[PDB]
Amino acid sequence: EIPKPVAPAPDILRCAYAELVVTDLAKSRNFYVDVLGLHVSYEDENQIYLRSFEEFIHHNLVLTKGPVAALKAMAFRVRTPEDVDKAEAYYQELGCRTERRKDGFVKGIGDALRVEDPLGFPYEFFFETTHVERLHMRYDLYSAGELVRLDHFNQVTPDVPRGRKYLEDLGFRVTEDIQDDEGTTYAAWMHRKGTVNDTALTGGNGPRLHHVAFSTHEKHNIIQICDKMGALRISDRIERGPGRHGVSNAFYLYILDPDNHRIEIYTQDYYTGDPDNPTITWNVHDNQRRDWWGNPVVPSWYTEASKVLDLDGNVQEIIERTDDSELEVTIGADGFSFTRAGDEDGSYHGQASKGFKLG
Amino acid sequence: EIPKPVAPAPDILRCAYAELVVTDLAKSRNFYVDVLGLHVSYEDENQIYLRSFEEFIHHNLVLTKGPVAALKAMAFRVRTPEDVDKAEAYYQELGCRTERRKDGFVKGIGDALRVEDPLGFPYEFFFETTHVERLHMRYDLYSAGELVRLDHFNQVTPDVPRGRKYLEDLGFRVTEDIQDDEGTTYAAWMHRKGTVNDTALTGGNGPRLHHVAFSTHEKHNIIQICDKMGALRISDRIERGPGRHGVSNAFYLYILDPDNHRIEIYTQDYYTGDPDNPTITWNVHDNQRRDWWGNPVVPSWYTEASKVLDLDGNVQEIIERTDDSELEVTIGADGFSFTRAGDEDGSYHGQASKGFKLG
Amino acid sequence: EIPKPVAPAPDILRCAYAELVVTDLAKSRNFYVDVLGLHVSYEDENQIYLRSFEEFIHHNLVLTKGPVAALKAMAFRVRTPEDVDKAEAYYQELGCRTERRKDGFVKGIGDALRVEDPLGFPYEFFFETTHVERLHMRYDLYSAGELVRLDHFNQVTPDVPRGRKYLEDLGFRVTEDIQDDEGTTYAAWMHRKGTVNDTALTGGNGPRLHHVAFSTHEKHNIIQICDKMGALRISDRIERGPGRHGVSNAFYLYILDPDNHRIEIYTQDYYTGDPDNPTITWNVHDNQRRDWWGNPVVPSWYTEASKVLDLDGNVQEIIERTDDSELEVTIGADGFSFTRAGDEDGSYHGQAS
Amino acid sequence: EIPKPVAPAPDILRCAYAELVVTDLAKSRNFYVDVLGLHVSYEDENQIYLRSFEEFIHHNLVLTKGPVAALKAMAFRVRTPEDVDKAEAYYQELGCRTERRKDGFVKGIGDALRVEDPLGFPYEFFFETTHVERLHMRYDLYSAGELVRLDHFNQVTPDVPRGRKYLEDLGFRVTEDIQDDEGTTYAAWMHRKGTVNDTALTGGNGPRLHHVAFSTHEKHNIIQICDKMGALRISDRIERGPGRHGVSNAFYLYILDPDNHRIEIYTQDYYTGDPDNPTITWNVHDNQRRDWWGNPVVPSWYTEASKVLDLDGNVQEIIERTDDSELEVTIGADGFSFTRAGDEDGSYHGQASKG
Ligand SMILES: O=[N+]([O-])c1ccc(O)c(O)c1
Ligand SMILES: O=[N+]([O-])c1ccc(O)c(O)c1
Ligand SMILES: O=[N+]([O-])c1ccc(O)c(O)c1
Ligand SMILES: O=[N+]([O-])c1ccc(O)c(O)c1
Ligand SMILES: [Ca+2]
Ligand SMILES: [Fe+2]
Ligand SMILES: [Fe+2]
Ligand SMILES: [Fe+2]
């Protein structure tokens, strides 16, 4: 169990940006700029800085050229400069390695703290950032698939309850989770900004980064991303979806960047900002929990995720999950899922929904 | 081969309605009225007559209680009363069984001809019909999933070129089809009303009815039908979709009624009314042909379809397809499909796309 | 009355394109290409040829540089090559001036007949056209405001019944109209292709071209056009809408090009292909007939429209409507409209809504 | 000027509900339930408690039968039970009349403080509320016009800067405002929950309630409300819109209930939760500031607004605005607006846009 520090937690506003290491900067630029339409704040031979349509901070995504594709940092904005000091004290009390740079790790961010958190994830906390032109009414630029905000991160970690307690002490509130009747937690979603999540924990070998999520205004904007991928004959890069989630109630799509970093496109979840927001627990065997329409979850969604780096830039060692596997208990050989609790009709035994089995 | 009659073809306007035999009338009413929101023109203990939001003719769907669920008639409206006489002469010259009723087979239809056509299907031709209130501006009734028009039928038949040639002589024009490089045809779509199709042929054991399709205004209306089915905890009756089709370019969904009759919800195909409208042929191995986003086609879509009746109400004997099976050549153990023609990346061998094999 | 020819009418498929004369080609190009996103089929220093997303014929719009902005031709595609000969015989019998060019008037059209029709409008009939890449699945090109098809034309003419009967003889069927209890017709919509309209008649001084209409897939695509015009700070070129029409039930928007040619963006009207399609007549005083939500129709919509050219390229003289004016009877000083017939609550007198 | 208390401000989460006095409970029910589709949490012969599709607290709207239609309370939920104590101390230091009830003023709310605030408005602060079934995935109930959240209130008050300072001290942050080149402020928007507003101030004679706003998921849902109103032949109850706002960037519609209470339908504004969120100031003569498409703002939108009650249920006396009137300066006889700053073309003198 990760103890609660005596030192006060930093006041975290929201997820703010991710820095992803990519192997071919021009290929990655083609995906995030030419395909997905993100807006360039700055670029050079080594990095691309990108932001969503409604953002006013410098960026929501930094692509950094390097030898091994991986998550380098997931960054959260805090409420005041002083909260960066609070973060440093808090993580030092937790016995974590930290690095502080008064003028930032990446361009357009000022005083910043990066940490190897207790789950092995590279987190950044910052307040100071270069404001840029907020493009929210630049409909002369607006794409039919426009990504309007950064919404969340999702992390793969072997022990979800351990992680959940640590994030709750840091001030995230769990909005939804997936459990079974035998005490296992498979996933949890938790927020600061009053949406279903700012980060989330998915049970699996880790630390690895499951995805970064961007939102659109409307469901048709997500449809258009699919449509455009078809027209560009890159439909093999659509991993899963589009769908309606059970957890979050958002309309969703998962796609894969050139280094296989998974990106979610997301819209129309609900308000969670009240402190007694009802926490929703879904049973892992409920076949509407991930896709509300019952569509099967592709096995790569459960097995594949991005490497993460330590503060030296080396890949973090993976620790195997020993708790039960969501894949195995739902769509694997001894798996089970239901449409209606207690009804054999519309249940699935040892395979996925809708007539499919694991490849 | 089906010869072209000397007698002139009737001038067919459009698909108009289907008569489906259903086993439990109240359960079918719950599906078509309470779930899907179709509008009742007439009903009693034996039949329910249903129409779409923008229709002015008496009905688009007749549910007839009977012992064996099946298609009893697929009905086309012709341009004038005299075209019914033309249909009679045309099918008599073909040597088909016909039955003429001056006062109709179903309520709200007048003089009508039913035939057991050369492919074994019960076709109706009629002009006269009782007009009803056209509900197209009744936004006090409009549902979030509103079905606005009847769009088309789709028929399963073993020999597609044989059926296509016969429908062309009837005045239907091919818009799109699916072939392989060695001369096999798997499917064809053909129209009278200037959309992608009024009826279509799917290669398979037949005669069977693959589906009846209704339109919505917008893509979100289709999404709502899925969302409603999830809320009603009947997501197991969502067979396939939602998606974007390759062929037709329509946004789509397939669902199953209580007797397993398949209903397609469909929107935003293109205009085909010019006589040199460009035909489009897709290769059967192109994994964007059916779902443009590359999502796998569930095997039941290829295997399952409704019985059809002869004019005595008995089930038509099925004739087996001898040409290659689309299922087998694409997603079966020796199947294959591609994302980009000639590229092994994004190709699938012996399984479906996205990581699934056949269940 | 325009008598019906004994010569058979050409079989008209649909409205196909318009040729608009524009005064500043580059400014017009910025509007139709950079603002509206139409696709270039051909251009040079004198003309731009444009098409919609789902089109396979060469173009839906030809912009031709000239001294005086006007409609030069409104073109209808006919079913066969022989229908061009039929059109020529038909209009000759009508006593109209005609001009046949076996190699076309504009690029990408072959054998074509232009006429000064009995209402003073320059109509073209053609079959042959150069096919181009149908862009209907080119979602790499698709705009948030994408114009997907050419839908219809709308003509201003002084005597709507006279024009209506002429168009009915040509095979157009009336789908909707606006009348009053006195028996005056203010407007009528008529089709060949099985939508509410291919060419409509608006009562007013004419011949003038009221608008050309393009369709989108969805209502949000129309919203986006408005939003883009705001961002470009050209919201003054949004004339009327967005709204829901009563007549047609379509979602709509009217905007003005750099020469004040009016373009409608339009979506989601209904199927009219059956020959007994029920005709809908609205009362001119019904405040939901034009905008279903009861928003007022600004006077410029009734009074302003494009000049049209004769076959020499000179502007056609205008004939003043003598029938009652829809503007005057609804929003002028003695006009009125209602929300509910017979209810003074929600009625407007001498005054728009 | 309203002084800043020594006492700490309550931590306000969001706007939560309004109580509206209505004169005919059945006609109001028909508007809010049958036309607009709001969900009944509770009703009896005196009151209807309504909530939006995604709400879990007891209600977002209380309709209370009474002799004079008016706003009775605009309620904000606070973060903790202790914040209701803080609210009470804060308003007492401001010298405002307060009333606290441990068991609530309306059903489904527990310990609650109502105040007559420094601008004459009846504010409620509460934490405790009865949770109900959150209908957010009840797509079996979902309307083509579904109202999904309560978004904000908008208040008419004669002196905007005076009010703005008071709300900022309470912890609201200004997101957008409208000013001119002569030192006048015409409107301001301010939030707690990280949207463009939870309440807003519109310069005018007051206290009056300008509107209550509810959100939809998508723009077509707003369109459907207009289409349904046409089908019901009540299009005369559509006041303004639908449109795109300049301020807030939201898609919008304004309609009128049977007592003329104005309801906004609203979707797709932007995130404001960062404390240095950039504040946007529009010029009052910019004809894209209220409707981005330059559609004219009807004079009733400026002149008409609901009465508000004091804690005894009596109508608050209206104080006249002496600052310049947005109506007069933009669409009055001597008004002016522009499409492009400094461009005569697309400008309007002494009349509204679009003819
Ligand atoms: O329901 N799941 O599959 C979820 C729900 C929300 C998420 O953002 C996600 O990435 C997974
Ligand atoms: O691409 N296919 O799967 C199609 C395309 C159009 C249809 O109407 C259909 O039922 C199947
Ligand atoms: O109702 N009107 O104002 C209409 C309806 C359809 C149209 O295409 C139009 O241009 C005007
Ligand atoms: O721009 N205005 O007109 C606005 C902007 C936002 C609002 O919520 C409003 O009621 C008015
Ligand atoms: Ca268990
Ligand atoms: Fe996610
Ligand atoms: Fe189909
Ligand atoms: Fe029009």
Ligand SMILES: [Fe+2]
């Ligand atoms: Fe508002």
